Design a binder for this molecule. Structure first.
Ligand code: A1A20
Length: 269
């Protein structure tokens, strides 16, 4: 609740050094204690929607047996920049399960767009988020246009608090059936793109699943994670940044430092 104040001045100093805005929401699932800094502001999702995309695919797999094993074929024209798995299987195709793992663990853009098409596009993923009680999340566009991160534009945004609340529901709550919940957790744990973000703030003997996002403009980048500290209940957190100038650079170091301050606020140093 009021752990925010153990670290509200440290967050203001971090954001001043960064030269932009940092949004943080962290929840101790044991006590319900929370740390919030700009937790209600909108930040561009960038690639961070791909974790929710995989969760929506897993949800649909509860109603559509065989969905995950469905082979998907795609042409050269489906490849977009940063498609490091899907480019290796262009001549063969991949299963829905494989595309979901590529979208989560490599942030694969072709895979993301192919899975968006299966769900009925950005409105389809937005519908899934509404179905679990998230009224903040909006996806509007596809890869790569959703990365514009225009100041003041609500398109393709959510808030750190809504991302944390939704992540808790999907990974630890009852939004997915048990097998689907563990598959989502296992994809997040195998992510390869987040070593310099939240993961950099967590001890090596704690389990962590995360999903990154990097727009590449307006100092805009983010990460959300579930962390299993030993001997206590899991922590769910979201760290989002943006900056006023198109040329402003994101900082992975600032996201790690924000994650450290959120864990210090919850008393999990
Ligand atoms: O779509 C992505 C995906 C990633 C990996 P994540 O978003 O951090 O999960 C990414 C990473 C660093 C940076 Br700079 C930019 C990125 N873009 C936008 C680019 C503009 C053309 C090429 C893709």
């Amino acid at each position: 609740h009021m752990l925010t104040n153990l670290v509200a001045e440290p967050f203001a100093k971090l954001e001043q050094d960064f030269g932009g805005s940092i949004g943080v929401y962290a929840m101790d699932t044991g006590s319900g204690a929370t740390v919030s800094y700009r937790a209600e502001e909108r930040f561009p999702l960038c690639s961070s929607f791909k974790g929710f995309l995989a969760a929506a695919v897993l949800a649909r797999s509860q109603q559509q047996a065989g969905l995950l094993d469905t082979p998907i074929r795609y042409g050269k024209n489906a490849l977009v920049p940063w498609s490091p798995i899907s480019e290796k299987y262009l001549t063969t195709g991949m299963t829905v399960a494989e595309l979901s793992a590529a979208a989560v663990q490599y942030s694969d853009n072709a895979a993301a767009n192919l899975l968006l098409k299966e769900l009925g596009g950005p409105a389809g993923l937005t519908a899934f988020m509404r179905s679990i009680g998230d009224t903040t999340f909006r996806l509007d566009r596809w890869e790569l246009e959703l990365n514009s991160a225009i100041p003041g534009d609500a398109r393709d945004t959510s808030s750190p608090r809504a991302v944390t609340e939704s992540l808790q529901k999907l990974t630890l709550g009852s939004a997915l059936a048990a097998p689907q919940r563990q598959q989502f957790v296992d994809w997040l744990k195998g992510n390869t793109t987040g070593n310099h973000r939240i993961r950099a703030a967590v001890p090596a003997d704690w389990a962590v699943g995360d999903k990154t996002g990097t727009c590449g403009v307006y100092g805009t980048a983010n990460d959300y994670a579930v962390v299993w500290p030993t001997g206590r209940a899991p922590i769910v957190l979201a760290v989002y940044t943006r900056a006023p100038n198109k040329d402003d650079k994101h900082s992975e170091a600032v996201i790690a430092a924000a994650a450290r301050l959120a864990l210090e606020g919850l008393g999990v140093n």
